[PDB]
Amino acid sequence: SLVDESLLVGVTDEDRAVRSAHQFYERLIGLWAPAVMEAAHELGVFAALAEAPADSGELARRLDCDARAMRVLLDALYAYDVIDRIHDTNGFRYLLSAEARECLLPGTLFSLVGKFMHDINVAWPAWRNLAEVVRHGARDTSPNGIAQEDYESLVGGINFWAPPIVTTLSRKLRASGRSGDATASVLDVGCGTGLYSQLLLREFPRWTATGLDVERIATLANAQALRLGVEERFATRAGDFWRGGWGTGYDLVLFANIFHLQTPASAVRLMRHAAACLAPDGLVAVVDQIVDADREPKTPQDRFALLFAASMTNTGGGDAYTFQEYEEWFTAAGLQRIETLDTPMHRILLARRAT
Amino acid sequence: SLVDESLLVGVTDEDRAVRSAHQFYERLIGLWAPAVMEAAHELGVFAALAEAPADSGELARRLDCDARAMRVLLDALYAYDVIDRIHDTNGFRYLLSAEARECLLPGTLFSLVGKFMHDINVAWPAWRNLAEVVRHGARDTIAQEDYESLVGGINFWAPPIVTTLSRKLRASGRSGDATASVLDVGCGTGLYSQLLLREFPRWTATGLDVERIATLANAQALRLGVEERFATRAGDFWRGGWGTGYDLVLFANIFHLQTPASAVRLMRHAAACLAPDGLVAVVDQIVDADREPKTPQDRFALLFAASMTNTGGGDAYTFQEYEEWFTAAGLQRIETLDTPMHRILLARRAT
Ligand SMILES: Nc1ncnc2c1ncn2[C@@H]1O[C@H](CSCC[C@H](N)C(=O)O)[C@@H](O)[C@H]1O
Numbered sequence A: 001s002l003v004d005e006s007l008l009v010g011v012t013d014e015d016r017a018v019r020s021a022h023q024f025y026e027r028l029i030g031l032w033a034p035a036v037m038e039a040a041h042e043l044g045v046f047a048a049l050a051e052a053p054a055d056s057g058e059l060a061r062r063l064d065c066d067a068r069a070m071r072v073l074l075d076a077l078y079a080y081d082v083i084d085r086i087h088d089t090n091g092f093r094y095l096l097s098a099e100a101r102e103c104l105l106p107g108t109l110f111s112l113v114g115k116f117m118h119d120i121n122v123a124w125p126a127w128r129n130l131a132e133v134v135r136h137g138a139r140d141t142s143p144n145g146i147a148q149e150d151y152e153s154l155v156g157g158i159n160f161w162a163p164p165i166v167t168t169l170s171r172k173l174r175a176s177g178r179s180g181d182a183t184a185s186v187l188d189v190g191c192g193t194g195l196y197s198q199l200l201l202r203e204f205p206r207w208t209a210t211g212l213d214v215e216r217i218a219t220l221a222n223a224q225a226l227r228l229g230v231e232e233r234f235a236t237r238a239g240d241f242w243r244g245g246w247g248t249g250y251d252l253v254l255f256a257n258i259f260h261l262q263t264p265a266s267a268v269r270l271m272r273h274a275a276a277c278l279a280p281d282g283l284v285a286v287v288d289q290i291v292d293a294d295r296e297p298k299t300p301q302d303r304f305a306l307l308f309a310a311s312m313t314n315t316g317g318g319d320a321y322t323f324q325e326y327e328e329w330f331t332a333a334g335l336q337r338i339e340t341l342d343t344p345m346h347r348i349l350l351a352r353r354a355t
Numbered sequence B: 001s002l003v004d005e006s007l008l009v010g011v012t013d014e015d016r017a018v019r020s021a022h023q024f025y026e027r028l029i030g031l032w033a034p035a036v037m038e039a040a041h042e043l044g045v046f047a048a049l050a051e052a053p054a055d056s057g058e059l060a061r062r063l064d065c066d067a068r069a070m071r072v073l074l075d076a077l078y079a080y081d082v083i084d085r086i087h088d089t090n091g092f093r094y095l096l097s098a099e100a101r102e103c104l105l106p107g108t109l110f111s112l113v114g115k116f117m118h119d120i121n122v123a124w125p126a127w128r129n130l131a132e133v134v135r136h137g138a139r140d141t142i143a144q145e146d147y148e149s150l151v152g153g154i155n156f157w158a159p160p161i162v163t164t165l166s167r168k169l170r171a172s173g174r175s176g177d178a179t180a181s182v183l184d185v186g187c188g189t190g191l192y193s194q195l196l197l198r199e200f201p202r203w204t205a206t207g208l209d210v211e212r213i214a215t216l217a218n219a220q221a222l223r224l225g226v227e228e229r230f231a232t233r234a235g236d237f238w239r240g241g242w243g244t245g246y247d248l249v250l251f252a253n254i255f256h257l258q259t260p261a262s263a264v265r266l267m268r269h270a271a272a273c274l275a276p277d278g279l280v281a282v283v284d285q286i287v288d289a290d291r292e293p294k295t296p297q298d299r300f301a302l303l304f305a306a307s308m309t310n311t312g313g314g315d316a317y318t319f320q321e322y323e324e325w326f327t328a329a330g331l332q333r334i335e336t337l338d339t340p341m342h343r344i345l346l347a348r349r350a351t
C-alpha cells in the first residue's frame, strides 16, 4: 500500500471524497511501476544484479549510469518488492531472489522480457492514444509485418501463463480417460513459443503435437521444444493458418490466447475448422479471457477479462468475449461444451462433437 | 485483484517462479488504469455521467464515440471501481458516486483533472524516457505551464494534512482568536493556507507563487470565503521580499524540488521571517536514512523520488537531511507527524 488508509478516517461527505481521491491517485500512480521495471530492463539492471549483487554505486559504474539516479531506481524497485536489498555496516547490496531471476532476465523460459519490450515498443504509445480509438472504433470488414515483429517478442513474454493452465487441463484430460501411453496427437493453433503443447508432451510421453504459427514464431517454437527435450514429438507448420492445411485426426485442438483476436465471423470459421480436424472423440480446448454476459467483475478472472478487453481495443484487437458467445460458436461447429475450468487469469472451455 | 492467487499455490521452485511471474505481470498492467481513466477524462465521460447516468450506447451518442469501444471503456472503469453500474431488465446504467463526482470532474475543489492533464501532457512521455535520465543524471550547478494544471490536481492531499497540523497547533497553545500570520511558500492553489484560515478565524495568510498560480489561489480563496484574510505576493520567491513576523511558515511539497544548497537557503530565509515563537512546518515525502519501505509513507517516498528523477527534480530526502537544514538555519525540530502520504515536520528557533 502507498496510502496510510488509517489516516483517512471519517464519514462526512468531504471525508469520503478526500479518501476516494487518495485511492484514485494511488490507482493513477500504478503507471510508475512498469516505467521503473522497464527502464531497469533497458539499462541491464536485472541481469547485472543476478550475476553479482552490488550497491548502487558499483552498479552505476558497471552500467555507465548516474550514481544518484541509479540509487533512486534501485530503491524504487526494492519498494515494489521486485528486487531485494540487504543492509550491512559496509552499506547496501541489491540482489534478486531465485524467483525474480527466472522472471526478469532475458532468455529464461518464463522471462517477462518479451512483455517489457511489447510495452516499450507497442503498448506504451498506443495507450496514450486510447481516447482516439474509442472515438473512432475499429472495423470488421495473418499478422502483418508489424504485428509479427511484435509477437516475436511478446510470445515469450506470456510463457508464464502456461504451466498452471496445462496442469489444470492435463488433470481433466487424465480424468476423462486420456492416457499418456496412448499415441494421441495435438494441434496447437497459433502456438506462439509452443509451450502449452510442449508441456503436454512432457506430461504425456507418447503424444505428438503440431503447432501452427508464422515462420519467425515457428522458429522460436522449435528451438524451445529442443530446450524442453520434446523436439522429436513437436513439429511446426509455418504460415498463415487461414490458408488451411492443418492436418486431421487430432485428439486435442488447442486455442490459447487466439479467440480474443478474432471477429465473431472469423471465430466461427476457426471453430468449424477445428471440428473438421478432430479424431473420433477428439476435444477442442479454448483458453482465453472469458466473462459472463452480465460482464460483472465478480472474480479475478472476470475483472481481468474486462480490463484485457480495453487492452484489445488499445491495439485494435477483438474482445473479451462472453461464455454465451463461445457457446454459440461451439454450436455452429457441431460441438458441445463439456467443461469450464478456472485458471489464474483465464478460463478453459473444453468441447467435443455433439452426440 | 486481477490474479486468482488461490490457483497459484505450490512450493516447488517452478511453482514459486510462475507465481512471481503472475505477480510481476499484475504490477506491470497497472499501466492500464491511468490510460483508461485519462482517456475517459479526455472524452468527457466523467462529466457526462455525473450529469445524467446512461448506458454505453447513449453515452457513445452523446460523446460522439464508437459504441462498442465505449462499452469496453466503461466496463473497464467499472472493473476499477472508478464508476458504478446498475443492471436492470432495461439494461445497464453507468453512474458516479458522490465521492467520485467530486474527484473526477473539472472545476471541483478536489478534482484530479490537473493530475490527469499533468500525466497526459508531461509525465507519460517522460516516464518512457526514464532510462535515459538514469543514464545521464541531473546537474546541481514548461514547468509553469505544467504547474498551472498540476496544483489543482494535488488539492486532495491538503485536508488530512491541515487537520493534523491544526490539531497540533491548537494543542501547542495557538488560538484561532489570535491575529496570527501565516506564510505559504510556493502556495499553489493556496488550499493549505485557506483551510488554516477556515480553522483559525482571526489568522491571515500570505501565499508566494508565480503570477499565473497566484491568480488561481486568490480565486480559490474567494470560493472558500477567506478572501479578506488571504493575499498573494506574485513572483519568484528567490527574489526575496517575503515579509516578516510570521507565526507559521509553511513549505508543502516544496523541499523535494530543491537541492541541498537551495534547501538550506530556503530554511534560513524562513527562519529570518519568523515572529518570536514562530514555527516552520515542512510537509513532504520524507523517509528515514535507512530508506526502508517500512510504512506506506516510506514506500511512497521512495517511489516519489523516482517521479522526481523522471521530471528532473530533487529527491525524497531523509529525516536526517531535514535535521541538518534545520540546524543550519538555527531551528530545532519539535514534532514529526504522519499523514496519509506525507510527514509534517514542525520546527522552532533553537534556544
Ligand atoms: N493468421 C495467423 N496465422 C498464424 N499464426 C497466427 C495467425 N494469427 C495469429 N497467429 C499467432 O497467434 C499467436 C497469438 S499469441 C498466443 C500464443 C500462444 N498460443 C500462447 O498462448 O502463449 C501469435 O504467435 C501469432 O503469431
Ligand SMILES: Nc1ncnc2c1ncn2[C@@H]1O[C@H](CSCC[C@H](N)C(=O)O)[C@@H](O)[C@H]1O
Pocket (backbone or CB within 6 Å): B147, B151, B154, B155, B185, B186, B187, B188, B189, B190, B208, B209, B210, B213, B235, B236, B237, B238, B251, B252, B253, B254
Ligand atoms: N521560485 C519559485 N517562485 C515561486 N513559486 C515557486 C517557485 N518554485 C516553485 N514554485 C511553486 O511551488 C509550487 C510547487 S507544487 C506545491 C503547491 C502547494 N504548496 C501544494 O502542496 O499543493 C508550485 O505552485 C510552483 O509554481
